[PDB]
Amino acid sequence: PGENLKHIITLGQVIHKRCEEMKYCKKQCRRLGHRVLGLIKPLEMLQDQSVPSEKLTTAMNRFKAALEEANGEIEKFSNRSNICRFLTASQDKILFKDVNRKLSDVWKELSLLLQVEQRMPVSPISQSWAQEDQQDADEDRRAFQ
Ligand SMILES: [Cl-]
């Protein structure tokens, strides 16, 4: 469990650094990196300190898989010609729509389990993504011309 947590933290840190380097569709890439860094922040605080339930282990594995899926999409979209093909085949122009929904859904479940089982604090503000994604997609579309 300690190794799984460390892996998730490292993977989130790598995704944020990669997002900051992406040359095209920067609003969407930077939003993904910002969101991922925000999710790993309480995990990093937890790491600096219980036996997980069945529900916690599966939530942790789903979160790890969603981050791996995001890392795979960042790799694909680092090449400009892959962005162009995706955008032309897309109606809403949102690069990370599926990855973003998986991350938000799993985080809702995972954060609650960490608060109940592992004494993770309840944050003054929880972690509107779909609406932000359309705005970012529109701004990136204009810059991609
Ligand atoms: Cl661009």
Numbering used by the authors: 0 to 48, 52 to 129, 132 to 149
Tell me what the authors wrote about this structure, in their words.
MLKL is a key player in the necroptosis pathway, encompassing a C-terminal regulatory and an N-terminal executioner domain. It gets activated through phosphorylation of Thr357 and Ser358 in its pseudokinase domain by RIP3 kinase and subsequently oligomerizes via its executioner domain and inserts into the membrane. To this end, displacement of the auto-inhibitory brace helix (α-helix 6) from the four-helix bundle is required, which depends on a specific composition of phospholipids in the membrane. Currently, two classes of compounds are reported to inhibit MLKL by covalently binding to Cys86 in the short α-helix 4 located on top of the four-helix bundle, which comprises α-helices 1, 2, 3, and 5.
First, we solved the structure of the unliganded MLKL executioner domain by X-ray crystallography and NMR spectroscopy to have a basis for detailed analysis of structural changes induced by small-molecule binding. Both structures of the unliganded four-helix bundle were highly similar (rmsd value 2.1 Å) and showed only minor differences from the two published NMR solution structures [NMR structure has an rmsd of 2.4 Å to 2MSV and an rmsd of 2.5 Å to 6D74 (12)]. The subsequent α-helix 6 packed with multiple contacts, against the four-helix bundle. The 1H,15N-correlation spectrum of the unliganded MLKL four-helix bundle showed only one peak for the Hε1–Nε1 correlation of Trp133, consistent with its side chain packed between α-helices 2 and 5 and, thereby, anchoring α-helix 6 to the four-helix bundle. The unliganded MLKL executioner domain had a hydrodynamic radius of 19 Å, which is consistent with a monomer.
